[PDB]
Amino acid sequence: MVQRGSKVRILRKESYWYQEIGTVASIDQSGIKYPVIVRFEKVNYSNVNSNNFSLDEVVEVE
Amino acid sequence: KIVIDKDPVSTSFDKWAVPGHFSRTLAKGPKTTTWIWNLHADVHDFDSYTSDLEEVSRKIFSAHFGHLAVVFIWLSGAYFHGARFSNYEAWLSNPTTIKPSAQVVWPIVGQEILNGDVGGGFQGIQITSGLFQMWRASGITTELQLYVTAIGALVMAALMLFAGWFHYHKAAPKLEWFQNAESMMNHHLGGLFGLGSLSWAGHQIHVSLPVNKLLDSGVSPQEIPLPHEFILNKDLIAQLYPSFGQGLTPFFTLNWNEYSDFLTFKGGLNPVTGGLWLSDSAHHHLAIAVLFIVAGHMYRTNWGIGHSMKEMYDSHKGPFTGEGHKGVYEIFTNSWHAQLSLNLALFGSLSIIVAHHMYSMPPYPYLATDYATSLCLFTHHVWIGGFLIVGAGAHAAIFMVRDYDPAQNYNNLVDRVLRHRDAIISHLNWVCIFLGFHSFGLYIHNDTMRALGRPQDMFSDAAIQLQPVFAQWVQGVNSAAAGNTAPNALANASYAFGGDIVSVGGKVAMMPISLGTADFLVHHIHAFTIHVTVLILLKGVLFARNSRLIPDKANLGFRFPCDGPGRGGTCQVSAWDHVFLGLFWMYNSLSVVLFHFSWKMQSDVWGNVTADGAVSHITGNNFAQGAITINGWLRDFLWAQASQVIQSYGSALSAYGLMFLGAHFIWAFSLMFLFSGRGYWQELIESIVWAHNKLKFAPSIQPRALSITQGRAVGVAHYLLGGIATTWSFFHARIISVG
Amino acid sequence: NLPSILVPMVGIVLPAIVMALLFVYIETDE
Amino acid sequence: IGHLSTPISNSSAVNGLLANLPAYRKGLTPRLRGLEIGMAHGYFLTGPFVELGPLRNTDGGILYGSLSAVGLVVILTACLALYGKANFSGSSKSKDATLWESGEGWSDFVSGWLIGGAGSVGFAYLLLQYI
Amino acid sequence: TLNLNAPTPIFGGSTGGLLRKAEVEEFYSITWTGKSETVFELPTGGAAIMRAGENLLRLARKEQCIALGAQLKDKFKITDYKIYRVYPSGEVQFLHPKDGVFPEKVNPGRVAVGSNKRRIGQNPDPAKLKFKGQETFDS
Amino acid sequence: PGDFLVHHAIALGLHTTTLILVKGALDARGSKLMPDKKDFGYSFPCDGPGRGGTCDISAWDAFYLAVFWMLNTIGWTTFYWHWKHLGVWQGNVAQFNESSTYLMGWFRDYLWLNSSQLINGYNPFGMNNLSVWAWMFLFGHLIWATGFMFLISWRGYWQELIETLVWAHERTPLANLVRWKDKPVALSIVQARLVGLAHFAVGYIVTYAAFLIASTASKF
Amino acid sequence: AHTVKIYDTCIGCTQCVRACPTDVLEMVPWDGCRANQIASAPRTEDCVGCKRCESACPTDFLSIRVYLGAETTRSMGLGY
Ligand code: CLA
Ligand code: CLA
Ligand code: CLA
Ligand code: CLA
Ligand SMILES: CC1=C(/C=C/C(C)=C/C=C/C(C)=C/C=C/C=C(C)/C=C/C=C(C)/C=C/C2=C(C)CCCC2(C)C)C(C)(C)CCC1
Ligand SMILES: CC1=C(C/C=C(\C)CCC[C@H](C)CCC[C@H](C)CCCC(C)C)C(=O)c2ccccc2C1=O
Ligand SMILES: CC1=C(C/C=C(\C)CCC[C@H](C)CCC[C@H](C)CCCC(C)C)C(=O)c2ccccc2C1=O
Ligand code: SF4
Ligand code: SF4
Ligand code: SF4
């Protein structure tokens, strides 16, 4: 179980931050798919720092 | 009226620490490396981030002061290197044999071979700027006068730099002080253009004309009295053109005919220098002054009388053209870019007129015989002028994207060109293809007729003639005006149309440039390549806001790469990308203009004159039968005349040979950016940020490829930098060696 | 002799035929 | 309105020439209007060949130049036949039903272009070599 | 419906508008009410004057009607523009708004057309769908 | 020494050409800038101006860039082989040995020097048995340069220009009367790269073939 | 016409829909929560393929994807 503010590593292979370390902004407390909002220090090509992932795409590197 | 704001901007270094302090986007820090290129791109585009037209206009006003400072800095180094590091003193004793040189090169690894045997007891780089012939026309005979002019330019640079700080940080004008166009037209015509040519005529009468008549008699440059001694000693100025004993009393009693010895209408070239008469130029700028001084008394001010330019555009309207010029004054007093477009149009068009009027009427003494100088002065101002014409079509397009208004432009002359822009472009489209076939195809015909053994089937003077009869008639009505339609002129406007040959030393200063079938062919190449340059730039100006393809092109901006791969593909649709495409076509237009110049002068005009009067030219009149084919443009011009830029290694011409190959390199380096696209290099960088992440040191500023619009700009910069500097190197090392 | 007959056939006449044959084939429809 | 209104647009000194040319004229059949187009175009097409040719000071320059002119008419007879097979595939109808909109007489136009074209090429050959 | 005919604005111009494609197949019309007599840029050139109206303008593409329709909502705040596509020589009446509500707003009763129940990394290989009628992106 | 430098230039060409081809192939299925590239096939225009810009992102475009590098590589190979053998065939090997160690030697003693006769295949005084090669030499330069037009100027400029021509045709009497069966449109994004490269590379080879044959046949 | 697919990573931001120059996209009720919205492409026959939609999508690697296909008068953006 990943809480907010925890450091994760992204398992989504199509993401820009695949196999990279980011910190969770928040977890949506409902049944919405991909609720894990991770904020990253590196920007992608669209210059955005956040994305939604699922629990299966994040880990608990801490 | 003058209304000034006191201290709007403080003088601190707090914003020097922050790059990109001026906009909301750039004052956040760089997340990528495109921020570095986005920083330097729109610093001097003040209209984008500052949305207050009063604030933009003060930034523009102080920027011109800072630009005036760096020209005075350049003017001081033009004079200081003329005083300390030049052979200007021995050049005045022998302007024909001793070559004009400055820029002594330091004794290091071997570039002290560039300090060549240039004349007298001097070793330096032979300069092709015309500064030696310009200072001789100005009257300068010693390097003490060149020294104070270098000091006088540095204090003028600091005065412009102080005025730029003062008029933004301390005492900034309001918006209404800038919109006073009628007072600004009044002042620049009378003060800047009238008194500038009035007082320079004051220099030319009191300083230039006394020392140059003593130079033409040829005593010595050291025996000539000083230019202030022609003011004190009134008997000394009465020895040459003896109308100074009568003073200003012929001027105030309207007996101006007494000044007919230093204010003449001789109209031609000096037989001893090969330049224009300085008495002609003294009478010239005086008449230019009075024409310009009264022209500054035309527009209305706060004293009732005068024209108002808003009421000259109202009631200049016809039945063909709707509202006429109604609304143009509200455009030109509110749009800084529509001002910049029209000011760049006729400042660049003027610079080609300067180049065309200075080889035919050489204004400076011993300029026409210096073939090393007059060719580079032509090719400079043509290149400088044509760059500004592309900036005319550039900033006219930025007017349409952000400064155009549908409400103010209703049925006026801006709107009526926007309503038939397909009629203008497609008729411009036809006349480019018509001129492309019927000028360039007459070489392809002549290449094919020469190759197939048929020299009687081509377009030549010994073949199907295409004679320039509309130009040979103008060669006849302008060469027969001495005594007929300009009766007080002693000779014609120049010797280019027709007349005798003028020989200073042994070389031609000026001779009749005869036109033929080969001159008909290149002049329709010029009219073709100019018309395509209009065709790209006017298509970008007219379709800047919308088209049939993209109707919301003004919502995306003046500068964006594309609107996607859809609609078939919309790459290079922007008004920026037409300027980017017109820069190559300006390069194509101007480079054949100077190839026309550098071969017509060397073959038909420039050369040596024997003691009997016969002329032996440089390349031997091979423009008539050579320039009609592309092969003759390749064999007898680009192959044969580039024999001195490639055999230059081991002499003082070696750095031109290094610049010859140095610009062949950067020209080809441009095609790496032009032919390619960004998404290749972004994934090539993705493997290179991998190996910097592999050894754990990748930068937090993420490495990005250049943008599509930037990679077009990086390519078009190195294309022009590599293309012109090839022509800079080929022209310089040729005419230094042959002329 | 046969060069003088054949090189305007495949140089002029035969390309005029196959361009005529390909142009009708392109702009036909069902 | 869609079309722009210039003062020189819709002028009867210009529109009157259009309605009386043999391409918009009301009474002509496709055999007649192709004969008039060919007789005008073949008459001036022998112009450039006889004074601008590979052989001009010959027996010979007028005969061979006029032979090239009928050579263009029989080329443009093929192009008028090729344009007819493409643009009229079953003589595709439209709203106006002219000769040019839907074909319906187009084989007579291409034949009439050939007679008037090769005739006026040969007719102008009579006026230069003879007459 | 289209309310043809309606008064075309006081324009008189534009070479760049509504050529032979319009009379053979599929031209477009945009109908709005301008609550002023202001001048506005066209997709072809720029002016007409907006009528009180019942205003109507025949354009060449659906692209130009939304590009003009974005201008009436931005500059003049009149969001009641109604684009159409004509009868017999045209195809489908009442192109926008298709549900009566602007497409940026959600409306119940619409159906999800073109949806994929996966990400793009979960899309199969093109070698897995070789020599088949299935598409790599379709579900 | 001359042979040393060129061999590393040729090596530079073989490595850079392979690099373009290897990176294009290994990123063909996807990269960070385009994770689903494989879904669009071998050849597609791009992926729009979004995500920073994506021109030349398809595997086909990588081959396209590599065709420029191979010609350059095979050029340096053939330039070297020709100049070296030229001295060898004339029994004056000293020219190549001393001039090939600096690039001005390749520009003055190889290109400019050996083009003397070729460029004179025809002139204002006559023509020799090299007029064909001289015409072809110029022919090659023109079609090489014509390829630059498609490679530098892209679709959008042309599509909008073509629209004014469509307008002009439809509004001119005696021409309006006839109509195209296929609507005129600008060349595609991928098409232009191919058409530009084809002109470039036909021109590249045709120019060198004309020079190589004529320069050697002139002096033997 | 071009094909425009919408993947299940959409966060109903409406940016794509408001970027489309020909009104190809609209927001429709999602049934996975009955609270949020997903993008849809009901009028793909009018898609010109400009890709303005994708350039507006905030998600790290697109939720809406445009795969250029068969070209038509509408898709080529012709006024003729
Ligand atoms: C020397 C005292 C001084 C100080 C401390 C300041 C300080 C400031 N100026 Mg002021 N100003 C000054 C003198 C000074 N200025 C002068 C002499 C001029 C006339 C040119 C101006 C005209 C001016 C304008 C129009 C503006 C400012 C602005 C500013 C503010 C931000 C500028 C900045 O941070 O970029 C620092 C910039 C640099 C370090 C680069 C200097 C570029 C120089 C002038 C020219 C370089 C060209 C040179 C030839 C290089 C070419 C290439 C080379 C290889 C040949 C800052 C408070 C801006 C502002 O207040 O915005 C709200 C603003 O818009 N200044
Ligand atoms: C882009 C930068 C640039 C550079 C580096 C140069 C460099 C040079 N110029 Mg050129 N010039 C340029 C642009 C440039 N020019 C442009 C765009 C024009 C057209 C306006 C000119 C017009 C010009 C003239 C007429 C002359 C030069 C000369 C020279 C050479 C001597 C330097 C000098 O101080 O002469 C100082 C300048 C003079 C002695 C003549 C000035 C007389 C003109 C008519 C004054 C006009 C001023 C006015 C404000 C501009 C017109 C505004 C109008 C459109 C409203 C030097 C090579 C001179 C030369 O050929 O030397 C042998 C020369 O006589 N230039
Ligand atoms: C040398 C290389 C080259 C050539 C030949 C062209 C040719 C052309 N350019 Mg291009 N251009 C080039 C490089 C070149 N460009 C580059 C590098 C760029 C990138 C910056 C561009 C960017 C550019 C733009 C932005 C534009 C052009 C336009 C044009 C056309 C101008 C009108 C014209 O002259 O038509 C007549 C054609 C010729 C003179 C070509 C030679 C034809 C010969 C003489 C006749 C043919 C012989 C024979 C019949 C051929 C076929 C035989 C066979 C079928 C049996 C012309 C086709 C413009 C245009 O399209 O305007 C309408 C235009 O706006 N070009
Ligand atoms: C590759 C095939 C090919 C061949 C065999 C030729 C052959 C010829 N061309 Mg060339 N030409 C070609 C391709 C070819 N061309 C291409 C691709 C171009 C574009 C670059 C040209 C551009 C060109 C021009 C501008 C000219 C020629 C001319 C000529 C002729 C010169 C000698 C002559 O006039 O005899 C004297 C004989 C005659 C004048 C009459 C010969 C027969 C004529 C052409 C046809 C007679 C009508 C015939 C009954 C029916 C038409 C045949 C047709 C339907 C197939 C020669 C017949 C010249 C010429 O005379 O044009 C006609 C000429 O001015 N050519
Ligand atoms: C200058 C001018 C003009 C004019 C131009 C033109 C338009 C011309 C053309 C003309 C032409 C272009 C003409 C035509 C003619 C025709 C003819 C002359 C024909 C004839 C033919 C014949 C007669 C033939 C017959 C035949 C046949 C059909 C078959 C059988 C046999 C024979 C052979 C008999 C205009 C008015 C515009 C305007 C002003 C300026
Ligand atoms: C080569 C190339 C690149 C790659 C080129 C890049 C990314 C430029 C980077 C090179 C510069 C020189 C990096 C500079 C790094 C530091 C500033 C060096 C500082 C050193 C100090 C000592 C001064 C593109 O991004 C591109 C984009 C679009 C079309 C064509 C092309 C293209 O051709
Ligand atoms: C000139 C030009 C055009 C306009 C050219 C077009 C639309 C085609 C013009 C070709 C005509 C038909 C002449 C063709 C002559 C060839 C010799 C014919 C070859 C045909 C083969 C099948 C043999 C573009 O559409 C374009 C698009 C993208 C980038 C660059 C450009 C570009 O440079
Ligand atoms: S700039 Fe790039 S994305 Fe845009 S049309 Fe050109 S290749 Fe395609
Ligand atoms: S597809 Fe992209 S733009 Fe559209 S709603 Fe989803 S996240 Fe927003
Ligand atoms: S490709 Fe362009 S037109 Fe098609 S849905 Fe996306 S944004 Fe809209």
Q: What stretch of H or E contains B616? A: strand B615-617
Cα separation of F25 and F62, whole Å? 8
Query: Has F70 been labeled as part of a binding site?
Result: no
Closest CA to A45 of B336, B679, B423, B316: B679
Ligand 5 pocket, mutate which of D39, D126, D129, D131 (most atoms under 8 A from CB):
D39
- Closest-lying ligand to the alpha carbon of B164? 1
F137: distance to nearest CA of chain D, Å?
25
DSSP letters for B349-394: HHHHHHHHHHHSS--STT-SS-HHHHHHHHHHHHHHHHHHHHHHHH
Please indicate whether residue B196, judged by its CB atom, sits closer than 6 Å to ligand 2. Answer: no
The contacts of residue B628 (CB under 8 Å, 6+ apart) are B443, B446, B458, B459, B460, B517, B518, B521
Q: How far is the CA of F52 from the centre of ligand 10 (A)?
A: 18
Query: For a substitution probing ligand 7, which of F187, F188, F190, F200 has the most ligand atoms within 8 Å of its CB?
Result: F187
Tell me if G54 sits within 8 A of G62, measured CB to CB.
yes
G contacts of B565 (beta carbons < 8 Å): 49, 51, 68
* 8 Å CB contact between B573 and B463: no
Contact yes or no for B215/B221 (Cβ under 8 A) = yes
Q: Which residues pair with B119 in a beta bridge?
A: B122
Kindly report the protein residue whose alpha carbon is nearest to atom 22 of ligand 5: D120
**F197 pocket-lining for ligand 7 (C-beta < 6 Å):** no
Tokens read off for B268: 């031609």
Euclidean distance between CA atoms D64 and D43, whole angstroms: 15
Nearest-CA neighbor of F106 among F80, F143, F85? F80
Q: DSSP state, E46?
A: B
Distance of residue E123 Cα from the nearest chain A Cα, in angstroms = 11
C-alpha of residue B357 to centroid of ligand 2, in Å: 13
**Joined tokens for residue F69:** 């590098």
CA-based torsion, A55, A56, A58, A59: positive or negative: positive
Q: To 10 degrees, what angle do helices B421-435 and F155-170 make? A: 100
How do beta strands B116-119 and A36-39 pair?
unpaired
Half-sphere exposure of B8 (CA within 13 A, CB side): 14
Residues 6+ apart with CB under 8 A from B638: none
Give, in degrees to the nearest 5, the angle at Cα B602 between B599 and B606: 145
Question: Which segments within B66-225 are labelled E, that is strand?
Answer: 101-102, 116-119, 122-126, 171-173
Q: Which residue has the tokens 């092969």?
A: B631
Q: Are D10 and D89 in contact (CB under 8 A)?
A: no
Exposed, middle or buried: residue F30 (CB in 10 Å: 0-12, 13-18, 19+)? middle
Ligand 7: does its nearest atom lie under 6 Å from the Cβ of F186? yes
Rounded Cα gap, residues B489 and B509, in angstroms? 20
Chain A interface disruption, residue of G57, G60, G65, most A CBs within 10 A: G60
- Please tell me if residue B415 touches chain D, with a CB cutoff of 8 Å: no
Which DSSP string corresponds to E102-138?
-TTS--BTB---SB-SS-STTSPPTTTTTTSS--SS-
Cα gap E53→B370, rounded to integer Å: 75
Q: Whole-angstrom Cα distance, residue A10 to residue A49?
A: 14
Angle, helices B336-359 vs B53-83, to 10°: value is 30
Residue A56 has what DSSP assignment? Answer: G
By C-alpha distance, which of E88, E72, E61 is closest to E39?
E72
Return d(Cα B554, Cα B391) in angstroms, integer: 19
Q: Which residues contact B542 (CB under 8 A, 6 or more apart)?
A: B400, B417, B418, B421, B424, B425
Q: Which two tokens stand for residue B696?
A: 């754990």
Helix (H, G, I), strand (E, B) or coil at E30: strand
CA atoms of B534 and B551, how far apart (whole Å) = 23
Provide, as residue numbers in chain G, all residues whose Cβ is less than 8 Å from the Cβ of B568. 71, 76-77
Pocket of ligand 1 (CB under 6 A): B 9, 11-13, 15-16, 21-22, 59, 62-63, 65-66, 70, 161, 164-165, 168-169
Rg (CA), chain F: 23
Q: What are phi and psi of B51, to 5 degrees?
A: -100, 20
Q: Are B708 and B678 in contact (CB under 8 A)?
A: yes
User: How do the domains of chain G map onto residue ranges?
Assistant: 1-80
Which ligand 8 atom is nearest residue B679's CA?
2
CA F92 to chain centre: 33
CA distance B499 to B487: 16
Rounded distance between C-alpha atoms, residue B109 and residue E78, angstroms: 75
Q: Whose CA is nearest to atom 52 of ligand 4?
A: D71
Specify the DSSP element, H or E, that contains B504: strand B502-504
Query: Which residues have C-beta within 8 Å of that of residue E16, sequence separation ≥ 6?
Result: B419, B421, B422, B547, B548, E44, E45, F167
Of D4, D7, D52, the CB nearest to B420: D4
CA dist., res. F38 & res. E135, Å (int): 13
D27, burial (CB in 10 Å: exposed 0-12, middle 13-18, buried 19+):
exposed
Q: Which atom of ligand 1 is nearest to the CA of B58?
A: 25
Separation CA B214–CA F129 (nearest Å): 63
Q: Given the CA of residue B33, which atom of ligand 6 is nearest to it? A: 7
Q: Name the phi and psi angles at E110, rounded to 5.
A: -85, 155
CB contact at 8 A, E68 and E17 = no
Residue E120: list chain A partners with CB under 8 A: 14
CA G51 / ligand 10 centre spacing (Å)? 5
SS3 E74: helix
Q: Which domain holds residue A43?
A: 1-62
Element (H, E) at G6: strand G3-6
Phi, psi of B456 (to 5 degrees): -90, 5
Tell me how far apart the alpha carbons of residues E62 and G74 are, in angstroms, rounded to a whole number.
8
Report CA torsion sign: F31, F32, F38, F43.
negative
d(CA B667, CA B650): 25
> Is there a contact between D75 and C23 if contact means CB atoms under 8 Å apart?
no
Distance separating alpha carbons of residues B371 and B126, to the nearest angstrom: 12
DSSP state of B190: I
Measure the CA–CA gap between E71 and E32, rounded to whole angstroms. Answer: 12
- Concatenating the DSSP letter of every residue in B557-615 gives -SS-SBS-S-TT--BT-SHHHHHHHHHHHHHHHHHHHHHHHHHHIIIII-EEE-TTS-E
State the Cα–Cα distance between residues F91 and F93, nearest whole angstrom. Answer: 6
The closest alpha carbon to F118, from F100, F96, F140, F103, belongs to F140
B187 annotated as ligand-binding: yes
Exposure class string for E67-105: b at 16+ Cβ within 10 A, else e: bbbbbbeeeeebeebbbbbbeeebeeeebbbeeeebbbe
Rg, chain G, Cα only: 13
User: Distance between CA E107 and CA E96 in Å, rounded?
Assistant: 14
Minimum CA–CA partner of D81 in chain C? C20
CA-to-CA distance for B463 and B449, rounded, in angstroms?
11
B122-126 vs B116-119, strand pairing mode: antiparallel
DSSP B170: I
Task: Tell me which residues of chain A have a C-beta less than 8 Å from any C-beta of chain G.
Answer: 14-17, 30-34, 44, 46, 48, 51-52
- Within 10 A of B235 (CB to CB), how many other CB atoms are there? 8
Three-state SS sequence of chain F: CHHHHHHHHHHHHHHHHHHHHHHHHHCCCCCCCCCCHHHHCCCCCCCCCCCCCCCCCCHHHHHHHHHHHHHHHHHHHHHHHHHHHHHHHHCCCHHHHHHCCCHHHHHHHHHHHHCCCHHHCEECCEECCCHHHHHHHHHHHHHHHHHHHHHHCCHHHHHHHHHHHHHHHHCCCCCCCCCCCCCCCCCCHHHHHHHHHHHHHHHHHHHHHHHHHHHHHHHC
Q: How many CB atoms lie within 10 A of CB B591?
A: 19
Which residues, 6 or more positions from D56, have their beta carbon under 8 angstroms from its beta carbon?
D50
Q: Smallest Cα–Cα separation from G77: which of F156, B482, B191?
A: F156
- Taking Cα atoms as reference points, which of B390, B158, B220, B190 lies closest to residue B306? B190
**Helix pair B708-738, B371-398: axis angle to 10 deg:** 160
Nearest to E10 by CA among F13, D8, B410: B410
Phi, psi dihedral angles at D107 (to 5 degrees)? -70, -25
CA gap D60, B456 in Å, rounded: 17
Q: Nearest CA to B116 among B734, B729, B652?
A: B652
CB-based touch A/D (3+ pairs, under 8 A) = no
Residue B316 marked in a binding site: yes
How many Å lie between the centroid of ligand 5 and the Cα of residue D43? 5
Atom of ligand 1 nearest to the CA of B60: 25
* C-alpha separations of B725 from A17, B659, B721, B731 in Å: 46, 7, 6, 10
Q: What is the rounded (10 degree) CA torsion for F211, F215, F218, F219?
A: -170
Q: Which amino acid is at B263?
A: L
Query: From the CA of B602, how far away is ligand 8's center (Å)?
Result: 47
CA G35-G40-G46 angle, to 5 degrees, is 155
Is residue B384 lining ligand 2, measured as CB closer than 6 Å? yes
**Best substitution site from B5, B9, B55, B60 to test ligand 1's pocket, by max atoms within 8 Å of Cβ?**
B9
**Residue G27 falls in which region: left (phi positive, over 0), alpha (psi -120 to 50) or beta:** beta
Residues B231 and B327: their CA atoms lie apart, in Å, by: 53
What is the C-alpha to C-alpha distance for residues B544 and B558, in angstroms, rounded to an integer? 7
A17-40 as b/e: b if 16+ CB within 10 A: bbeeebebbeeeeeeeebebbbeb
Strands of the sheet containing E55-59, edge to edge, are E55-59, E28-32, E82-85
Helices B371-398 and B575-600: crossing angle, nearest 10°?
Answer: 160
Beginning with the edge strand found earlier in the chain, give each strand of the sheet holding B607-609 in spatial order.
Answer: B502-504, B507-510, B607-609, B615-617
* DSSP H or E segment with residue B198: helix B196-203
| All residues at 6 or more sequence positions from F10 whose CB lies less than 8 Å from its CB, including other chains | F73, F76, F77, F80
**What residues have CB less than 8 Å from C10, skipping those under 6 apart?**
none
Asked if residue E33 lies in contact with residue E9, where contact means CB atoms within 8 angstroms, the answer is: no
**Residues preceding chain discontinuities in chain B with C to N over 2.5 Å:** none
- What is the Cα–Cα distance from F192 to F195, expressed in whole angstroms? 5
- Distance from C-alpha of F160 to C-alpha of B540, rounded to nearest angstrom: 10
- List the alpha helices (DSSP H) in D1-131: 12-18, 30-51, 61-87, 106-129
Residue E57, classed as helix, strand or coil, is: strand
Which residues face F104 on adjacent strands? none
Residue numbers in E near D1 (CB within 8 A)? 8, 11-12
As a whole number of angstroms, the distance between CA B203 and CA B216 comes to 18
Number of domains in chain A: 1
Cα B557 versus chain centre, distance: 29
Contacts of residue B626, defined as CB under 8 A and 6 or more positions apart, other chains included, come to B518, B632, B633, B635, B636, B637, F123, F124
User: From the DSSP assignment, how many helices (H) and strands (E) are in chain A?
Assistant: 0, 4
- Taking the CA of residue G72 and the nearest CA in chain E, the distance in Å comes to 13
Tell which residue, A2, A3, A4, A10, has the closest CA to residue A44.
A10
DSSP, residue by residue, B102-135:
E----SSTTGGGSSEEEETTEEEEEP-S-HHHHH
Of G38, G62, G78, which has the smallest distance from its Cβ to E120's Cβ? G62
The 3 state secondary structure assigned to B294-312 is HHCCCECCCCCCCECHHHH
Of B368, B439, B627, the closest CA to residue B515 belongs to B627
Q: How far is the CA of B56 from the centre of ligand 1 (A)?
A: 15
- Expressed in angstroms and rounded, the spacing between residue G24 Cα and the centre of ligand 10 is 6
HEC string for B227-293? CCHHHHCHHHHCCCCCCCCCCCHHHHCCCHHHHCCCCCCCCCECCCCCCECHHHHHHHHHHHHHHHH
Chain G interface, Cβ < 8 Å to E: 3-9, 12, 14, 17-18, 21-23, 25-30, 37-38, 40-44, 46, 48, 61-62, 65, 67, 73-74, 77-80
What is the distance between the alpha carbons of residues B730 and B641, in angstroms, rounded to a whole number? 8
G10 vs G56: CA distance, rounded Å? 12
For the structural domain made of D12-129, what CATH number should be given? 1.20.1240.10
Distance from CA of residue B578 to its chain's centroid? 21
Question: In Å, how far are B392, B502, B504, B630 from B605, measured between CA atoms?
Answer: 34, 11, 14, 22
> Are E76 and E23 a contacting pair, CB within 8 Å?
no
- Residue B144's H or E segment, with its range, is helix B143-165
Q: Nominal resolution in Å? A: 3.2
On the question of a cis peptide bond just before residue F72, with omega within 30 degrees of 0, the verdict is no
Q: What count of other Cβ atoms lies within 10 Å of the Cβ of residue B712?
A: 24
